[PDB]
Design an enzyme around this catalytic site. Sequence first.
Site, PDB file in Angstrom:
ATOM      1  N   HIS A  41      44.004   8.991  56.549  1.00 40.33           N
ATOM      2  CA  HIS A  41      43.322  10.165  55.974  1.00 40.33           C
ATOM      3  C   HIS A  41      43.877  11.494  56.531  1.00 40.33           C
ATOM      4  CE1 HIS A  41      40.833   9.423  59.635  1.00 40.33           C
ATOM      5  NE2 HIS A  41      40.712  10.740  59.648  1.00 40.33           N
ATOM      6  N   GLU A  72      44.160   2.031  56.552  1.00 42.60           N
ATOM      7  CA  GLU A  72      43.831   3.314  57.191  1.00 42.60           C
ATOM      8  C   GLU A  72      44.907   3.710  58.205  1.00 42.60           C
ATOM      9  OE1 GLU A  72      42.013   5.153  55.613  1.00 42.60           O
ATOM     10  OE2 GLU A  72      42.081   6.766  57.071  1.00 42.60           O
ATOM     11  N   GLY A 146      37.508  14.960  65.292  1.00 43.00           N
ATOM     12  CA  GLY A 146      38.678  15.330  66.057  1.00 43.00           C
ATOM     13  C   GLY A 146      39.275  14.206  66.901  1.00 43.00           C
ATOM     14  N   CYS A 148      40.240  11.229  65.755  1.00 39.73           N
ATOM     15  CA  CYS A 148      40.960  10.281  64.931  1.00 39.73           C
ATOM     16  C   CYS A 148      42.412  10.262  65.387  1.00 39.73           C
ATOM     17  CB  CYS A 148      40.845  10.609  63.434  1.00 39.73           C
ATOM     18  SG  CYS A 148      39.236  10.128  62.839  1.00 39.73           S
TER      19      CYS A 148
HETATM   20  C1  5F2 Z   1      38.136  11.549  62.633  1.00 39.22           C
HETATM   21  C2  5F2 Z   1      38.723  12.488  61.586  1.00 39.22           C
HETATM   22  C3  5F2 Z   1      38.251  13.940  61.628  1.00 39.22           C
HETATM   23  O1  5F2 Z   1      38.033  14.615  62.642  1.00 39.22           O
HETATM   24  O2  5F2 Z   1      38.111  14.564  60.331  1.00 39.22           O
HETATM   25  C4  5F2 Z   1      37.349  15.747  60.153  1.00 39.22           C
HETATM   26  C5  5F2 Z   1      36.367  15.457  59.040  1.00 39.22           C
HETATM   27  C6  5F2 Z   1      36.673  11.139  62.292  1.00 39.22           C
HETATM   28  C7  5F2 Z   1      36.015  10.594  63.571  1.00 39.22           C
HETATM   29  C8  5F2 Z   1      34.705   9.810  63.406  1.00 39.22           C
HETATM   30  C9  5F2 Z   1      33.875  10.222  62.184  1.00 39.22           C
HETATM   31  C10 5F2 Z   1      32.802  11.175  62.688  1.00 39.22           C
HETATM   32  N1  5F2 Z   1      32.703  10.833  64.081  1.00 39.22           N
HETATM   33  C11 5F2 Z   1      33.718  10.093  64.512  1.00 39.22           C
HETATM   34  O3  5F2 Z   1      33.844   9.690  65.649  1.00 39.22           O
HETATM   35  N2  5F2 Z   1      36.750  10.211  61.167  1.00 39.22           N
HETATM   36  C12 5F2 Z   1      36.451  10.537  59.885  1.00 39.22           C
HETATM   37  O4  5F2 Z   1      36.027  11.622  59.503  1.00 39.22           O
HETATM   38  C13 5F2 Z   1      36.596   9.478  58.837  1.00 39.22           C
HETATM   39  C14 5F2 Z   1      37.670   9.887  57.863  1.00 39.22           C
HETATM   40  C15 5F2 Z   1      38.043   8.774  56.925  1.00 39.22           C
HETATM   41  C16 5F2 Z   1      38.212   9.086  55.572  1.00 39.22           C
HETATM   42  C17 5F2 Z   1      38.589   8.077  54.674  1.00 39.22           C
HETATM   43  C18 5F2 Z   1      38.820   6.767  55.134  1.00 39.22           C
HETATM   44  C19 5F2 Z   1      38.669   6.468  56.484  1.00 39.22           C
HETATM   45  C20 5F2 Z   1      38.271   7.467  57.383  1.00 39.22           C
HETATM   46  N3  5F2 Z   1      35.370   9.253  58.081  1.00 39.22           N
HETATM   47  C21 5F2 Z   1      34.231   8.881  58.668  1.00 39.22           C
HETATM   48  C22 5F2 Z   1      33.063   8.709  57.734  1.00 39.22           C
HETATM   49  O5  5F2 Z   1      34.146   8.705  59.870  1.00 39.22           O
END
Ligand code: 5F2
Length: 181
Positions: A41, A72, A146, A148
Amino acid sequence: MGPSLDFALSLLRRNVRQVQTDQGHFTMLGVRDRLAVLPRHSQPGKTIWIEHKLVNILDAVELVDEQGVNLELTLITLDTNEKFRDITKFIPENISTASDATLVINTEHMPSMFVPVGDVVQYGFLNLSGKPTHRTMMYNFPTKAGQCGGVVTSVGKVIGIHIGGNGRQGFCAGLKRSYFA
Ligand SMILES: */C(=C/C(=O)OCC)[C@H](C[C@@H]1CCNC1=O)NC(=O)[C@H](Cc1ccccc1)NC(C)=O
């Protein structure tokens, strides 16, 4: 200094990079040669900002399973002078769970950040943002935006890439060695 800190710090110094895409800040793992992995993503385009420099991406491969499902993970091949230290021997042949794991994050916002996510267990299917993703693992740690791309690690093994969360539990895409062969 002790062994488990040595490994994580070494991983940081040589394999875990601060990056930004049009989606923002991620932690990137360089696996070997010019090959790194990012969460899908993060949407790397033709270039990616890596620490202090824009870097051209020669090729990107989003991994899916045999039932066409998302995993992913995007494999990127960089146009860089640097070869990454080859850490594919620290990645299990098959997705592996672990105990007292540590999540290693490295972005401009969360630099050299260690998060004790504890035991890591199999998890399977996950729904992130109405996207479903296989081959997934879970830790009961309330992970954060943040984080990820952050690297799930324990006992000198490299087992996952943080992709998702819910306020209580955080989830990674499991790593296996074949992805980097
Ligand atoms: C990491 C990505 C980020 O910072 O994006 C800003 C929106 C986050 C970390 C996770 C989710 C919230 N708390 C956490 O520890 N991950 C995501 O936002 C993740 C993105 C995603 C999109 C599509 C497919 C797979 C993952 N989505 C979710 C719902 O966590």
